[PDB]
Amino acid sequence: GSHSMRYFDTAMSRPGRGEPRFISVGYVDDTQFVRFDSDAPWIEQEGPEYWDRNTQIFKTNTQTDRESLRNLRGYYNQSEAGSHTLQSMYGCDVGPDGRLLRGHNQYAYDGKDYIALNEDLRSWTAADTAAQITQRKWEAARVAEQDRAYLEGTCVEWLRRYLENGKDTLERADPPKTHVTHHPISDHEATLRCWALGFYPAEITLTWQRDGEDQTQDTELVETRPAGDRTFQKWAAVVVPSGEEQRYTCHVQHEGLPKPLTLRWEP
Amino acid sequence: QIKVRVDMV
Amino acid sequence: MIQRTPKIQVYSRHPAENGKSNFLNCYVSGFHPSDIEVDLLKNGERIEKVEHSDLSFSKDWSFYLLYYTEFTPTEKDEYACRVNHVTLSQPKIVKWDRDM
C-alpha cells in the first residue's frame, strides 16, 4: 500500500548545562530506522559513504538549529535563563506505485506551530510576526526550492530504496489479534473491553456498536501504544447493563485484515 | 536519507 | 509558555501469564516540554535497568517515550510506573492492571 518517510527533529536548549541537545529520528511508516543524537538491518546494508554523508548533514543541522534557537529567543524577547524547544518534522508520502502523494516540512517552537512549507512546496505559512521574519528570510534565500528538491527527489528516491531493501517487514501488515473481555463493575453493569494486539502498522479503527449504532460518546478508547517488538496495541471499552451484552458488537478495521472483524462477548 | 538544514530561522 | 501533561499507560508486551517471562512497558505520551522522569516499580521499589525508546513526537508536536524492562509476572508481585514532569505537582503512579 501507501508509505511515508519522516524525520522527527528536536533541538532543546539547557542554559548552564552545555550546548542544546539535538536529536533527529528517521522513520519509514511506524518503523524507526535511524537516530542521530548530539549527546551520543536494512539500513546498515547502505555502506560507509551513506553513513558519512548522513552524519555530516546531521552535524550541520545541529549547528543550524543551535543558531535558530539563539534567533528564536530574540524574536520572542526571551531571557537567556529558560530552556526552549525547536522541533522540525519533514518527509514525503508515496502511494502503492511509489509516486509522490505529498511533501511535508514544518517547524514548532515551544510546542506551538511556527512555520510550515505549504502543500505546493513553494510557499510558507507563518504562525505569527516572528515566523513572518523567518518567511521573509527564507523567501529571499529561496529555501523552498531546496526543500522542494529534497521532498520530490531525494525523499521519494530513498523511500523507494528502503521499501525494496526492507520489503519483508516494511511491506508486511500484521493483523490485530482480537478478543473481548467482560468485567463486572456492580450487579447492574459490566465493562466489555475489545482488544487488538500485535498489529502493524499502528493505524487501526476499533469501535463498539449497540444495536448497530455507534457508541462514540460512551466508548473509552485508549491511545494506540507500542508493544516494543514493532507491533502496537489498542482497546475500546463500553459499560453495559448486565444481561444486555449481546446487543454490543466490537468492529475492527486494519490493513492486515482482508475483511473487517465483528466480535461479541463469548461467555 | 536526512535533509540538510542550512538556513536558520 | 504552554505545557502539556503526560498521558500514561502501563502494560505488558505479550498477554500476561504468571511465571512466564514478558516485558513491562510504561508508555508516556502527549507531553510538552520533553524532560520527563519515568520509573518502573516492583512492589513500590525502583527497577534497576530499564531501557527507553528514542525521543520522538506526534503530528501535534507532543512527545512520547516507551520505558521497558524484562519481567516475569506472578499473582503476588505488584508493578507500577511512576512519572514526574514539570506539569505535575508530585509524581503520578499508575499501577499495572493486566486487564488494561
Domains and CATH numbers, chain C: 1-100 (2.60.40.10)
Burial A138-160 (b: 16+ CB within 10 A, else e): beeeebbebbbebbeebbbebbe
CB-nearest to B3 from A75, A90, A115 is: A90
CA-nearest of C65, C54, C61, C85 to A23 is: C54
Name the grid cell of A158: 530513498
CA dist., res. C54 & res. A32, Å (int): 9
DSSP A136: H
CA–CA–CA angle A97, A27, A198 (5° rounding): 90
Q: How many residues does chain C have?
A: 100
Strand partners, A9: A24, A88
**Interface contact A147, partner B, CB < 8 A:** yes
Q: Which CATH class is domain A1-172?
A: alpha beta
Mutate which: A4, A25, A57, A143, vs B, most B CBs within 10 A = A57
**Nearest Cα to Cα of residue C4 among C61, C53, C59:** C61
* Burial environment of residue A1 by CB neighbours within 10 A (0 to 12, 13 to 18, 19 or more): exposed
Residue type for position A88:
S
Q: How many CB atoms lie within 10 A of CB A261?
A: 17
Distance from CA of C8 to the nearest CA of A (A): 10
Pick from A60, A86, A155: CB nearest B4: A60
Whether A122 contacts chain B with CB within 8 A = no
Three-state SS for A69? helix
Distance between CA atoms of residues A142 and A128, nearest Å: 20
Q: Is A143 on the interface with B (CB under 8 A)?
A: yes
Q: Where in chain A is the domain with CATH 2.60.40.10?
A: 173-263
Q: How far apart are the first and last CA of chain C?
A: 34
Phi-psi label, residue A79: left if phi above 0, alpha if psi -120 to 50, beta otherwise: beta
Give the phi and the psi of residue A148 in degrees, each rounded to 5.
-60, -45
The residues near A99 (Cβ < 8 Å, ≥ 6 apart) are: A156
The sign of the CA dihedral A197, A199, A203, A208 is: negative
Inter-chain contact A115–B9, Cβ cutoff 8 Å? yes
**B3 with A115: Cβ contact below 8 A:** no
| A131 Cβ contact list (under 8 Å, min separation 6) | A114, A115, B9
All CATH 3.30.500.10 domain ranges of chain A, comma separated, are 1-172
Residue A228, min C-alpha distance to chain C (Å): 7
Strand partners, A114: none
- d(CA A49, CA A53) in angstroms, rounded, equals 6
Dihedral pair phi/psi, residue A187, rounded to 5°? -80, -10
Experimental technique behind these coordinates: X-ray
Superfamily of domain A173-263: Immunoglobulins (2.60.40.10)
Q: Which chain B residue has its CA at the smallest distance from A114's CA?
A: B9
* Separation CA A140–CA A143 (nearest Å): 8
Cell digits of residue A86: 525547536
In one letter, which amino acid is A117?
L
Q: Look at C55 and A222 and tell me if their CB atoms are within 8 Å.
A: no
Q: Residue C13 to residues A84, A146, A161, A170: CA-CA distances in angstroms?
A: 34, 42, 31, 21
What is the experimental resolution, given in Å to one decimal place?
1.6
